[PDB]
Design an enzyme around this catalytic site. Structure first.
Site, PDB file in Angstrom:
ATOM      1  N   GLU A 135      -9.335  -5.392  -3.997  1.00 23.50           N
ATOM      2  CA  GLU A 135      -8.597  -4.263  -3.443  1.00 23.50           C
ATOM      3  C   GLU A 135      -9.514  -3.219  -2.815  1.00 23.50           C
ATOM      4  OE1 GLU A 135      -5.462  -3.550  -3.040  1.00 23.50           O
ATOM      5  OE2 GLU A 135      -4.470  -5.205  -4.088  1.00 23.50           O
TER       6      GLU A 135
ATOM      7  N   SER B  53       0.857  -1.194   0.000  1.00 20.01           N
ATOM      8  CA  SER B  53       0.000   0.000   0.000  1.00 20.01           C
ATOM      9  C   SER B  53       0.889   1.239   0.000  1.00 20.01           C
ATOM     10  CB  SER B  53      -0.991  -0.105   1.160  1.00 20.01           C
ATOM     11  OG  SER B  53      -1.403   1.180   1.598  1.00 20.01           O
TER      12      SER B  53
ATOM     13  N   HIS C 259      -7.827  -5.650   1.028  1.00 25.01           N
ATOM     14  CA  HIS C 259      -6.547  -4.959   0.953  1.00 25.01           C
ATOM     15  C   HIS C 259      -5.663  -5.315   2.144  1.00 25.01           C
ATOM     16  CE1 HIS C 259      -3.910  -1.827  -0.559  1.00 25.01           C
ATOM     17  NE2 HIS C 259      -3.880  -1.253   0.631  1.00 25.01           N
TER      18      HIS C 259
HETATM   19  N1  LIG Z   1      -6.436  11.597  11.655  1.00 23.45           N
HETATM   20  C1  LIG Z   1      -7.813  11.193  11.462  1.00 23.45           C
HETATM   21  O1  LIG Z   1      -8.683  11.707  12.083  1.00 23.45           O
HETATM   22  C2  LIG Z   1      -8.143  10.087  10.473  1.00 23.45           C
HETATM   23  C3  LIG Z   1      -7.154   9.433   9.817  1.00 23.45           C
HETATM   24  C4  LIG Z   1      -7.480   8.429   8.922  1.00 23.45           C
HETATM   25  N2  LIG Z   1      -8.778   8.118   8.713  1.00 23.45           N
HETATM   26  C5  LIG Z   1      -9.132   7.056   7.808  1.00 23.45           C
HETATM   27  O2  LIG Z   1      -9.266   5.973   8.678  1.00 23.45           O
HETATM   28  C6  LIG Z   1     -10.319   5.104   8.415  1.00 23.45           C
HETATM   29  N3  LIG Z   1      -9.803   4.052   7.559  1.00 23.45           N
HETATM   30  C7  LIG Z   1     -10.189   4.013   6.265  1.00 23.45           C
HETATM   31  C8  LIG Z   1      -9.702   3.021   5.436  1.00 23.45           C
HETATM   32  C9  LIG Z   1      -8.838   2.098   5.919  1.00 23.45           C
HETATM   33  C10 LIG Z   1      -8.316   1.014   4.979  1.00 23.45           C
HETATM   34  N4  LIG Z   1      -7.304   0.335   5.248  1.00 23.45           N
HETATM   35  O3  LIG Z   1      -6.884  -0.645   4.335  1.00 23.45           O
HETATM   36  C11 LIG Z   1      -8.450   2.137   7.217  1.00 23.45           C
HETATM   37  C12 LIG Z   1      -8.941   3.129   8.050  1.00 23.45           C
HETATM   38  C13 LIG Z   1      -8.488   3.166   9.508  1.00 23.45           C
HETATM   39  N5  LIG Z   1      -7.263   3.224   9.757  1.00 23.45           N
HETATM   40  O4  LIG Z   1      -6.786   3.261  11.078  1.00 23.45           O
HETATM   41  C14 LIG Z   1      -9.763   8.756   9.376  1.00 23.45           C
HETATM   42  C15 LIG Z   1      -9.440   9.761  10.269  1.00 23.45           C
END
Ligand SMILES: NC(=O)c1cc[n+](COC[n+]2ccc(/C=N/O)cc2/C=N/O)cc1
Ligand SMILES: *[C@@H]1O[C@H](CO[C@@H]2O[C@@H](C)[C@@H](O)[C@@H](O)[C@@H]2O)[C@@H](O[C@@H]2O[C@H](CO)[C@@H](O)[C@H](O)[C@H]2NC(C)=O)[C@H](O)[C@H]1NC(C)=O
Ligand SMILES: *[C@@H]1O[C@H](CO[C@@H]2O[C@@H](C)[C@@H](O)[C@@H](O)[C@@H]2O)[C@@H](O[C@@H]2O[C@H](CO)[C@@H](O)[C@H](O)[C@H]2NC(C)=O)[C@H](O)[C@H]1NC(C)=O
Ligand SMILES: NC(=O)c1cc[n+](COC[n+]2ccc(/C=N/O)cc2/C=N\O)cc1
Ligand SMILES: CC(=O)N[C@@H]1[C@@H](O)[C@H](O)[C@@H](CO)O[C@H]1O
Ligand SMILES: CC(=O)N[C@@H]1[C@@H](O)[C@H](O)[C@@H](CO)O[C@H]1O
Ligand SMILES: *[C@@H]1O[C@H](CO)[C@@H](O)[C@H](O)[C@H]1NC(C)=O
Ligand SMILES: *[C@@H]1O[C@H](CO)[C@@H](O)[C@H](O)[C@H]1NC(C)=O
Ligand SMILES: C[C@@H]1O[C@@H](O)[C@@H](O)[C@H](O)[C@@H]1O
Lengths: 533, 528
Positions: free
Chosen positions: A329, A201, A442
């Site tokens: 994906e 990724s 993914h």
């Molecule tokens: N700094 C923030 O508030 C923040 C950062 C990133 N996201 C996106 O996170 C949601 N998300 C969206 C997509 C994925 C997909 N991963 O393969 C994973 C995740 C979670 N990761 O910890 C939301 C808020």
């Protein structure tokens, strides 16, 4: 008294490691080796400076802190999401790397595998259980290195032109670790003349940017890009949009009380790390999936030009590259914003939710561009079949963000003098916690690449363990010789004409043609022409 | 023979008795329905034929309206069958009536044929339009008329009264009015008139549906491999004026009044010789003088009138042949010929796209190439020849027909759709052209029943089954025999049947994927 195999001297000073137990045998591990001064206080947002020498012995006996980052809370306690979350304390003092080597230390130089974790440039850590390097090292007798690099605003907030926040410092963290490998890996028995980068990724996108950046290109010899590419619409950002997001982030935390860069960065340095994390996602121009606030910036320095232009104008003779994707994906990302999607139901969406999801999955494009996407991914004999619509949106997000950026990179590299091997990972792990409609999501080939099924604490099937051993052999054969085939069904090179790749699953290798050629022709050939007009 | 003597409103007529393998039929050929549009009446709307004394001889076909004659393959049967088989003349407004023998004494359903030919050619006297077999086998009255083609029928200086345009369409409407007033004298039922036509004839049928003064002159419609919303069927007022203006310059003529006056001094053959040099670019399936949208005959574009129309109480029969475009490729597409396999290269394919899709932006052309390229075999000659044939066929015929069918069905009309997939054993065109444009007509007119021809026994049975479908539709609005059944076409199910020697097979989608490209996406692209 002391075990000599666990004592090593590097340029900075002396180190002490540990003898790790693996099912196959002992492994020497040096975890938490400092390679840079802690990027804290006045050093926040700045490029990494080398770790100054130390007297005495540094105990490299466990993983160091995770770089400060967002923590996922969509499914609290869920195995599928918690496996990617930090398993160590968060801190800006996070620039440490890890070295696994065979026990006893190799007496002849041994090929080196350098891992770069992914996570949308906003998350990730080399300490995650799925990145455990002990199984690869024991089974294939390589040297494996992994490093931590700054993520989110701490690693990629850019005020281009300024010296206080030049951007791309997270990539400079990786480059500094690669320079550390060149100067020090021979003390662990590693061969600095045979260094293979591999990542997934954003890590795969990072690997690609090192290929395209001359100061990094001399630090390794081979590359492996898993489910990621530097030419992805999410992997880079323009200088103007980078400045807008940095300025809005500072505005959301009270800086300045834009204007002057020096005062603005200095005000941002007084803010607690968690405060920046809490607002980093409010700077995105629209609601979206597979879009990240702070990513590498194309500013003429690290990237002389856009990755696509560098890929097209590059001479890649003497380079071997292994690329690939998983079967589904896009499925993972749909439950993070696409209307009608959730892991706890089958997400059988309506036509209206599909059309709305297209704008979320392909953000910041004209309505004409969205109409072209709808035309290509609609089955006009079954235009409102809920199942087909769910799979179509998954393909939209997957092809646009991963499969077609990877295919375009692989095609241009092969045509311009590079030997390329391509794969599609099609095995769904028996232990997978995600719902079954997501298929092979993914990032879920990684655990097989690292040999995690050989962990006796886990419950993979015996056939999945043989599969893991076969994949570790492919990756290590490529690291050693530039060819995943053993010196047996053969894995043919990928070329722009035949476009051959192999299926990776429990069955033997199967050769196929075309990485979604029809769909990727739309994304890589036509839609750029539509955006220009 | 009193059966061959008929009195219409204009005067008395004398017909001829014809023979078919199933018995005799009565024919009345060369009936004048308009005053000869010559001299000062060139480019003008048709005038009703003034009454005559004596008996008009209606025993042979009259002259063909002046038109271009194809010369690419001289003596070749595949092209000569469409060329004029009577002398050329501007004195050409005559129609023909076929009735059973003896003449029906009870009202008989009426079929009215409008020939095709790109609005530049065609004639009701062609051998393949012989109505004697349909009339004998299915006991209907069949009428066919000659209408002005080329500049004589569709040259337009919009806003002027000396060349208003669409006078070839008014020729057809006048013949339809003639049928309403006189077909009962032949045993025909003026309350049961079915329009059927092919290619530009099908486009003409569609335009009569969308024009209120013609809509009340018939009751049912059959559109074969043509539609009024085709990119070739109509032209705007501005382009029609430009094409007419360049034609005058090409023939040595200078204000609309002074211009038409000079055009009226030119011999008919002179206008024919220059009609194709007014086209804006090299192309296929593009015609110089076609119906114009000027607010009169068509108050709006056919596609706009289609979308806004209430079509309840209407039954239409629409269809296409298996390979609509293959025929047109040998008239301008680089690398194509009937005398070789036409295995073109990628470069010729890309060049042929601009000829097959003329007068569109480079971006629109790239979108065509994207949809019609197999990116696993991007340079395969056999696939490229097949693809360019689909480009021309979908863009000009299949997808305009699919669009008309879907809109009519979703707005109250009962629609029956077909694909004609039988290649005639007597076909002289090369095998790579499949079933080309126009080669279903001979089967609908029952030409295989002619013993002087070499059709098979199963082809004769096939022709009889097709005549039954068409006549059933003319009688009841339903082609089915009161098998398996022929289901109606709907916007959702998109059901149609395949027409060949095998029994009816129901299928879904008239090239739904390709037609979403042409009917939904490309209009958005060209306007943005
Ligand atoms: N700094 C923030 O508030 C923040 C950062 C990133 N996201 C996106 O996170 C949601 N998300 C969206 C997509 C994925 C997909 N991963 O393969 C994973 C995740 C979670 N990761 O910890 C939301 C808020
Ligand atoms: C499938 O799930 C989505 C997501 O809803 C969440 O997850 C479900 C498992 C359940 O716990 C819901 O209560 C959660 O909100 C459903 O879409 C949601 O529907 C609700 C109610 O109409 C609405 O308030 C939310 O905004 C919707 N969220 C999104 C992202 O669209 C969807 O309806 C479910 N499908 C079913 C139940 O058939
Ligand atoms: C298939 O035929 C086309 C054109 O028809 C040919 O025209 C004459 C030359 C005649 O003598 C026959 O070969 C055919 O009837 C060929 O395309 C032409 O190629 C010539 C060069 O050989 C070139 O000058 C013309 O421009 C081409 N014509 C067009 C319309 O583009 C084509 O090469 C033939 N296919 C083969 C030979 O495989
Ligand atoms: N008057 C002219 O010079 C003239 C008139 C008409 N054409 C048309 O001839 C080409 N052609 C000839 C025959 C057909 C038959 N189609 O079924 C179609 C086409 C179509 N496009 O080029 C050419 C020149
Ligand atoms: C154009 C300009 O005003 N530049 C100055 C810059 O040199 C200085 O570093 C900063 C902090 O004092 O203030 C501002
Ligand atoms: C870089 C910084 O923080 N401050 C500098 C300082 O030298 C001074 O206030 C001024 C003079 O050029 O430029 C600015
Ligand atoms: C494997 O399953 C067994 C079943 O009880 C359980 O004891 C064990 O903890 C599981 N391992 C993992 C890693 O979930
Ligand atoms: C076939 O029919 C044609 C007329 O269509 C005729 O001239 C010919 O003699 C017949 N026989 C053969 C073998 O072609
Ligand atoms: C302290 C910094 O340097 C000095 C001045 O240019 C400004 O007050 C700035 O805040």
């Amino acid at each position: 008294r002391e075990d000599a195999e666990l004592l090593v001297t590097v340029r900075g000073g002396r180190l002490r490691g540990i003898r790790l137990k693996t099912p196959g045998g002992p492994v020497s591990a040096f975890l938490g080796i400092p390679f840079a001064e802690p990027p804290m206080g006045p050093r926040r947002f700045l490029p990494p400076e080398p770790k100054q020498p130390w007297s005495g012995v540094v105990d490299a006996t466990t993983f160091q802190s995770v770089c400060y980052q967002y923590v996922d809370t969509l499914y609290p306690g869920f195995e599928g999401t918690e496996m990617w979350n930090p398993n160590r304390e968060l801190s800006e003092d996070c620039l440490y790397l890890n070295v696994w080597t065979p026990y006893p230390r190799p007496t002849s130089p041994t090929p080196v595998l350098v891992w770069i974790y992914g996570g949308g440039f906003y998350s990730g850590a080399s300490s995650l259980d799925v990145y455990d390097g002990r199984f690869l090292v024991q089974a294939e007798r390589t040297v494996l290195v992994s490093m931590n690099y700054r993520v989110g605003a701490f690693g990629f907030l850019a005020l281009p032109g300024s010296r206080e926040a030049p951007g791309n410092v997270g990539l400079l963290d990786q480059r500094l670790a690669l320079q550390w490998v060149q100067e020090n890996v021979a003390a662990f028995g590693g061969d600095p003349t045979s260094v293979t980068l591999f990542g997934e990724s954003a890590g795969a996108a990072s690997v690609g940017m090192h290929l395209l950046s001359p100061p990094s290109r001399g630090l390794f010899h081979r590359a492996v890009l898993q489910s990621g590419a530097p030419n992805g619409p999410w992997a880079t950002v323009g200088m103007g949009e980078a400045r807008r997001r940095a300025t809005q982030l500072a505005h959301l935390v009270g800086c300045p009380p834009g204007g002057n860069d020096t005062e603005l960065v200095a005000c941002l340095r007084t803010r607690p790390a968690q405060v920046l994390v809490n607002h980093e996602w409010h700077v995105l121009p629209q609601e979206s999936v597979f879009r990240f606030s702070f990513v590498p910036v194309v500013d003429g320095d690290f990237l002389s030009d856009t990755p696509e232009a560098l890929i097209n104008a590059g001479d890649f003779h003497g380079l071997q590259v292994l690329v690939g994707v998983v079967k589904d994906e896009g499925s993972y990302f749909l439950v993070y914003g696409a209307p009608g999607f959730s892991k706890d139901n089958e997400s059988l969406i309506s036509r209206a939710e599909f059309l709305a999801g297209v704008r979320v999955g392909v953000p910041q494009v004209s309505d004409l561009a969205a109409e072209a996407v709808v035309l290509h991914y609609t089955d006009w004999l079954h235009p409102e079949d809920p199942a087909r619509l769910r799979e179509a949106l998954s393909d939209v997000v997957g092809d646009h963000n991963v499969v077609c950026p990877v295919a375009q990179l692989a095609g241009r590299l092969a045509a311009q003098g590079a030997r390329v091997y391509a794969y599609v990972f099609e095995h769904r792990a028996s232990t997978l916690s995600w719902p079954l409609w997501m298929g092979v999501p993914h990032g879920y080939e990684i655990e097989f690449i690292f040999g995690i099924p050989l962990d006796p604490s886990r419950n993979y099937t015996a056939e999945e363990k043989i599969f893991a051993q076969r994949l570790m052999r492919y990756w290590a054969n490529f690291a050693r010789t530039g060819d995943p085939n053993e010196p047996a069904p053969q894995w043919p090179p990928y070329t722009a004409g035949a476009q051959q790749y192999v299926s990776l699953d429990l069955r033997p290798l199967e050769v196929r043609r075309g990485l979604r050629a029809q769909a990727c022709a739309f994304w890589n050939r036509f839609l750029p022409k539509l955006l220009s007009a």
